[PDB]
Swiss-Prot record, chain A:
It is found in: Cytoplasm; Endoplasmic reticulum membrane; Preautophagosomal structure membrane; Cytoplasmic vesicle, Autophagosome membrane. The gene is ATG14. The lineage of its organism: Eukaryota, Metazoa, Chordata, Craniata, Vertebrata. It comes from Homo sapiens (Human). The coiled-coil domain is required for BECN1- and PIK3C3-binding and for autophagy. Forms homooligomers; homo-oligomerization is essential for the roles in membrane tethering and enhancement of SNARE-mediated fusion. Component of the PI3K (PI3KC3/PI3K-III/class III phosphatidylinositol 3-kinase) complex I (PI3KC3-C1) in which the core composed of the catalytic subunit PIK3C3, the regulatory subunit PIK3R4 and BECN1 is associated with ATG14. PI3KC3-C1 displays a V-shaped architecture with PIK3R4 serving as a bridge between PIK3C3 and the ATG14:BECN1 subcomplex. PI3KC3-C1 can associate with further regulatory subunits. Interacts with PIK3CB. This is Beclin 1-associated autophagy-related key regulator. Ubiquitinated via 'Lys-6', 'Lys-11' and 'Lys-63'-linked polyubiquitin chains on multiple lysines by MARCHF7, leading to ATG14 aggregation and loss of interaction with STX17. Transmembrane segments: none annotated. The chain holds residues 100 to 148 of 492 of the full protein. It comes from the Eukaryota. Belongs to the ATG14 family.
UniProtKB/Swiss-Prot annotation, chain B:
This is Phosphoinositide 3-kinase regulatory subunit 4. It comes from the Eukaryota. Component of the PI3K (PI3KC3/PI3K-III/class III phosphatidylinositol 3-kinase) complex the core of which is composed of the catalytic subunit PIK3C3, the regulatory subunit PIK3R4 and BECN1 associating with additional regulatory/auxiliary subunits to form alternative complex forms. Alternative complex forms containing a fourth regulatory subunit in a mutually exclusive manner are PI3K complex I (PI3KC3-C1) containing ATG14, and PI3K complex II (PI3KC3-C2) containing UVRAG. It comes from Homo sapiens. Ubiquitously expressed. Signal peptide: none annotated. HEAT repeats lie at residues 5-42, 98-136. Disulfide bonds: none annotated. Belongs to the protein kinase superfamily. Ser/Thr protein kinase family. Myristoylated. It is found in: Late endosome; Cytoplasmic vesicle, Autophagosome; Membrane. Regulatory subunit of the PI3K complex that mediates formation of phosphatidylinositol 3-phosphate; different complex forms are believed to play a role in multiple membrane trafficking pathways: PI3KC3-C1 is involved in initiation of autophagosomes and PI3KC3-C2 in maturation of autophagosomes and endocytosis. Involved in regulation of degradative endocytic trafficking and cytokinesis, probably in the context of PI3KC3-C2. The gene is PIK3R4.
UniProtKB/Swiss-Prot annotation, chain D:
This is RB1-inducible coiled-coil protein 1. It is found in: Nucleus; Cytoplasm; Cytoplasm, Cytosol; Preautophagosomal structure. Belongs to the ATG17 family. Part of a complex consisting of ATG13/KIAA0652, ULK1 and RB1CC1. This complex associates with ATG101. Interacts with PTK2/FAK1 and PTK2B/PYK2. Interacts with GABARAP and GABARAPL1. Interacts with ATG16L1; the interaction is required for ULK1 complex-dependent autophagy. Interacts with RNF111, SKI and SMAD7. Interacts with COP1 in the cytoplasm of proliferating cells in response to UV stimulation. Interacts with TP53. Interacts with C9orf72. Interacts with WDR45B. Interacts with ATG13; this interaction is increased in the absence of TMEM39A. Interacts with WIPI2. Interacts with TAX1BP1. Expression levels correlated closely with those of RB1 in cancer cell lines as well as in various normal human tissues. Abundantly expressed in human musculoskeletal and cultured osteosarcoma cells. The FFAT motif is involved in the interaction with MOSPD2, VAPA and VAPB and its phosphorylation regulates these interactions. The chain holds residues 1 to 492 of 1594 of the full protein. Probably involved in the tumorigenesis of breast cancer. RB1CC1 is frequently mutated in breast cancer and shows characteristics of a classical tumor suppressor gene.
UniProtKB/Swiss-Prot annotation, chain E:
Signal peptide: none annotated. This is Beclin-1-C 35 kDa. It comes from the Eukaryota. It is found in: Mitochondrion; Nucleus; Cytoplasm. The chain holds residues 151 to 200 of 450 of the full protein.
């Protein structure tokens, strides 16, 4: 049981590192999409202006 | 005069006006009646300290009886809501001596039509609470309640079920058999595609890992745990890493459209034969009700049907057949 | 038009999707705790949540945190559902405020609702709305329901567009139809400006029309 | 004699007045509920090395309840919920004022003509330090009292375990020889089929009594009884249930929990620290008395003791002693927190044993069934052999 | 008595092998997993920041 707890700690650490990388990537993707939409709207408005 | 009027009038007024149509009024009446029982109790304690206990016993009996009588209201939704909200130590008036005794029957009477399956999860939580001081030996009597909740309608009620699961794992007293039973059952349900259900399952899993813990965890579950853990990398005392170890939950939508069907029961046998093909000797495709079965099978296979699916698919598919018979009977109304 | 006293019926409605996107993903708060990644939005093509909705008469609770049934939004949050809140029509009708939340995992250890807003059950003049009232989102925060509600959901350029559209569609337009077409065309430009507007969270709240006059009936408390 | 009680569940100081000494048995429970923050429904208390208090017997019946031999209390919900024993320490207003005053005194500069106020503050600080040392001594006593409540918990575990082992191992061992007795039962079941045939062949003074006995033990009921007795009597049903009962016992059997660290080994260090704190309080009192004697010396110093810097020296000594005392106050607060710390550390093994208890409570329902079954077996052997003779 | 001793010992031995060293093998995985995931998370944080 003790070894199981230690291994759970370490393996959950590695997995949490991966999961954090993943969530950061998802947020970056959402931000990039928002930026692209804003850039498109800005370009259209700039042409009209 | 105040000491004398406390119980006499307090119960008198509480009852005389207790009769009211408003279900919310009745639930409030219940919560306030609990408060007023605490009040009369403090009044008796102060009288004892100031100025035998047999009156105290009669009062506590009246308290438990009042809790039950309140449970007699037809607005079962009202009772469920009031209990779930107040907690009130679940009326803390009869305990295992009588709380199990009359409370088991009272909750069982709730086993009517499951329209409010959310109320079903609420009742599961309420049973877990009643497990606090009523289930040492009737814990198995809840195990039949465990199966009944397995018969519950709401998948949100299913998340509430995993919650109350961990809750009993704390409470316990009927675990070992039901313990391994739930371990095996979840093993296929591991990749369960219900984010609420998946997370609450990982949580009940960590709670059980605490409760049974020991090497018992390894042998009993870790084999059942292997059905989901992509890697043995998790703090089983934790649910987030635990799920991280587990494989990604399968598309519940795909089986649901599969679930949406009617004759999948025989299609279920066909899927079992296909699994045997995966691990066995079935090379051929029997002559099922070809159009729908074949269409769905090809759609799923081309969809990316992977190796690990079929087993947990069949397990939760028996669960499905249950829930689907449930839906068909609900169509009666 | 109708008086609220007679009905006193329980609350029920339909489900709609929130306009506010999950750009509220706590980038730094994500950088802190591992649980949040377990967020349904954090890990799905879209985000489902556990709905919570209640009504409080100027802050006094009058119903339960109603939650919708199991439905799919992890790939598209398009909500096509109904919900029956626990508030009677006459129940605390005066100053009643529709507060709600949706429970979605702020983390594996943080699965709960963090979105809330409060709006009066009736309108700014007292008429009840049984029609969709898209709500102003208060992300990373939940509803309060008080008369001084801290997360307004329902009661300017977009305001002008909406008010003019309501007036015209009420039957307030002259036989010169050409404007209505141009009216919608320019409402298109106004909505385009509003959508180009960012750093805001919104939600579409669809009050279910009542089969009593069979509309988004305007009820007034009495 | 006022009741002395420590919530063995907390092993914490929550005493009772003699006012409840002679009141009803439930009076102690209601006192824990009201005076103590310990309700009734989810609560428990028993006699260490003795039985759990009944509803009638007085404490002294199991002589206890003293400041050195009190009764042990357990909040049922305490382990029922995870509830690492909460130490939501009451308002530290005394401790907060102590901290504020100590900070001021450390920030207090040398006193020139302020010697009287400095001596007054030093005396107040010494009295407060003595009061806090006494409170911490009572705390170390309550730690030894948690140790005594743990002894009581081990005794209660041993007792309940003895009852459960009695019933269980009784039914079990009885079946153990019942194995050959099981072959005899098989012969009896052959005779039972024979008796069923005879009764079919025997439709219908001592005969009157036998028939009366037949009225509540109908033929179909007895046949079902024998059938189920054999079926659940599936020897594995015991041997597997045997492993089950052994597992319940083991679940009780957490040896390391009781032998935590030689709790007396650490309690000795705790008592030594309490002694050091008392010595510090005595030294602070001695320094305050020296400060009074020094006020007298400064008053008489106008003529014969004209050496300078007396007031500055007094203020500096007061500040130094205040800093020293505040230092020990640090260990005092550390022990205040270690209260809840060791409380959860115990609640761990507590829950271990308690869950063993609930599982073995299911096991004991099974064991009452096993009694009933072995009884059915033997008593039926005799009486139903008679009734089947026909 | 020996029967009860066995009733405990058989169950105890059941999981003893069931306590598979697979995770014991997983123990060394953290060593390679740990520093690499640390570098990866730092890079992901920098990317998210930009």
């Amino acid at each position: 049981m003790e070894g199981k707890w230690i291994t759970d700690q370490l393996r959950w650490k590695i997995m949490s590192c991966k999961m954090r990388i993943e969530q950061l990537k998802q947020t970056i993707c959402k931000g990039n999409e928002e930026m692209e939409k804003n850039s498109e709207g800005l370009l259209k408005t700039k042409e009209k202006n | 005069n105040d000491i004398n009027i406390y119980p006499e009038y307090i119960l008198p007024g509480i009852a005389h006006l207790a009769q009211d149509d408003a279900t919310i009024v009745r639930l409030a009446y219940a919560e306030n009646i609990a408060l007023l029982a605490e009040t009369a109790l403090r009044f008796l304690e102060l009288v004892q300290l100031k100025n035998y206990d047999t009156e105290l016993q009669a009062l506590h009996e009246m308290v438990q009886q009042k809790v039950v009588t309140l449970l007699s209201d037809p607005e079962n939704i009202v009772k469920q809501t009031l209990m779930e909200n107040g907690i009130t130590r679940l009326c803390v008036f009869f305990g295992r001596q009588k709380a199990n005794d009359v409370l088991l029957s009272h909750m069982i009477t709730f086993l009517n039509d499951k329209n409010d399956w959310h109320l079903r999860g609420a009742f599961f939580d309420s049973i877990v609470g009643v497990a606090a001081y009523v289930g040492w030996q009737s814990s198995s009597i809840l195990k039949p309640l465990l199966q009944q909740g397995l018969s519950d309608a709401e998948e949100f009620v299913i998340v509430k079920a995993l919650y109350a699961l961990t809750c009993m794992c704390q409470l316990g007293l009927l675990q070992k058999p039901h313990v391994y039973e739930f371990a095996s059952d979840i093993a296929p349900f591991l990749c369960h595609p219900n984010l609420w259900i998946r997370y609450g399952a990982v949580g009940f899993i960590t709670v059980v890992a605490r409760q049974i813990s020991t090497a018992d965890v390894y042998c009993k579950l870790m084999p059942y745990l292997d059905p989901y853990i992509t890697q043995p990398i998790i703090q089983i005392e934790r649910k987030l890493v635990l799920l991280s170890v587990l494989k990604e939950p399968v598309s519940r939508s795909i089986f649901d459209y599969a679930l949406r069907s009617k004759d999948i029961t025989s299609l279920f046998r066909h899927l079992h034969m296909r699994q045997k093909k995966r691990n066995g000797s079935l090379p051929d495709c029997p002559p099922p009700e070809d159009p729908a079965i074949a269409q769905l099978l090809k759609k799923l296979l081309s969809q990316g049907m992977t190796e690990e699916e079929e087993d947990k698919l069949l397990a939760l598919k028996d669960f499905m057949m249950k829930s689907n018979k449930a839906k068909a009977n609900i169509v009666d109304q | 038009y109708i008086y609220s006293c007679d009905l006193d019926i329980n609350v029920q409605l339909k489900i709609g999707s929130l306009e506010g996107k999950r750009e509220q993903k706590s980038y730094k708060a994500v950088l802190e705790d591992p649980m949040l990644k377990f967020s349904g939005l954090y890990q799905e093509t879209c985000s489902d949540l556990y709905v919570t909705c209640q009504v409080f008469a100027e802050g006094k609770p009058l119903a339960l945190p109603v939650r919708t049934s199991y439905k799919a939004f992890s790939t598209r949050w398009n909500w096509n559902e109904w919900l029956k809140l626990p508030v009677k029509y006459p129940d605390l009708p005066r100053n009643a405020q529709v507060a709600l939340t949706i429970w979605d995992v702020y983390g594996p250890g943080k699965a709960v609702p963090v979105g809330g807003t409060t709006v009066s059950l009736f309108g700014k003049y007292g008429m009840f709305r049984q029609g969709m009232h898209d709500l102003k989102v208060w992300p990373n925060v939940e509803a309060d329901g008080s008369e001084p509600t801290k997360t307004p959901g329902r009661t300017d350029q977009m305001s002008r567009l909406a008010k003019l559209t309501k007036a015209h569609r009420q039957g307030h337009m002259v036989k010169v139809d050409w404007l209505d077409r141009l009216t919608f065309r320019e409402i298109e430009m106004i909505n385009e400006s509003e959508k180009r507007s960012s750093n805001f969270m919104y939600l579409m709240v669809e009050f279910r029309c009542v089969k009593c006059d069979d509309k988004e009936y305007g009820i007034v408390y009495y | 004699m006022k009741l002395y009680v420590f919530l063995v569940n907390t092993g914490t100081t929550l005493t009772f007045d003699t006012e409840l000494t002679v009141q009803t048995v439930a009076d102690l429970k209601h006192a824990i509920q009201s005076k103590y923050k310990i309700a009734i429904q989810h609560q428990v208390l028993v006699v260490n090395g003795g039985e759990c208090m009944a509803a009638d017997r007085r404490v002294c019946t199991y002589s206890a309840g003293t400041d050195t031999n009190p009764i042990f209390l357990f909040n049922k919900e305490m382990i029922l919920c995870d509830r690492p024993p909460a130490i939501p320490k009451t308002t530290f207003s005394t401790e907060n004022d102590m901290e504020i005053k100590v900070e001021e005194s450390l920030m207090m500069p040398a006193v020139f003509h302020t010697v009287a106020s400095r001596t007054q503050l030093a005396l107040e600080m010494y009295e407060v330090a003595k009061k806090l040392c006494s409170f911490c001594e009572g705390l170390v006593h309550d730690e030894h009292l948690q140790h005594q409540g743990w002894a009581a918990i081990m005794a209660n575990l041993e007792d309940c375990s003895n009852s459960y082992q009695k019933l269980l191992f009784k039914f079990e061992s009885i079946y153990s020889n019942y194995l050959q007795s099981i072959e005899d039962i098989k012969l009896k079941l052959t005779h039972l089929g024979t008796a069923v045939s005879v009764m079919a062949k025997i439709p219908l003074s001592l005969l009157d009594w036998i028939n009366v006995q037949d009225r509540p033990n109908d033929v179909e009921s007895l046949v079902r009884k024998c059938f189920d007795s054999m079926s659940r009597l599936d020897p594995r049903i015991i041997r597997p249930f045997i492993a089950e009962c052994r597992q319940t016992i083991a679940k009780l059997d957490n040896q390391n929990m009781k032998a935590i660290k030689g709790l007396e080994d650490r309690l000795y260090a705790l008592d030594q620290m309490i002694a050091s704190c008392g010595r510090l309080v005595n030294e602070q009192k001695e320094l305050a008395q020296g400060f009074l004697a020094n006020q007298k010396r400064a008053e008489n110093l106008k003529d014969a003791s004209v050496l300078p810097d007396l007031c500055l020296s007094h203020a500096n000594q007061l500040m130094i002693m205040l800093q020293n005392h505040r230092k020990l106050l640090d260990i005092k607060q550390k022990c205040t927190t270690a209260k809840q710390e060791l409380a959860n550390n115990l609640h761990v093994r507590l829950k271990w044993c308690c869950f063993v208890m609930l599982h073995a409570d299911q096991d004991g329902e099974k064991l009452q069934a096993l009694l009933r079954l072995v009884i059915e077996l033997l008593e039926r052997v005799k009486i139903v052999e008679a009734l089947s003779t026909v | 008595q020996l029967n009860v001793t066995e009733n405990e010992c058989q169950n105890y031995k059941r999981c003893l092998e069931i306590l598979e060293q697979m995770n014991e093998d997983d123990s060394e995985q953290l060593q390679m997993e740990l520093k690499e995931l640390a570098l990866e998370e730092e890079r992901l944080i920098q990317e998210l920041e930009d």
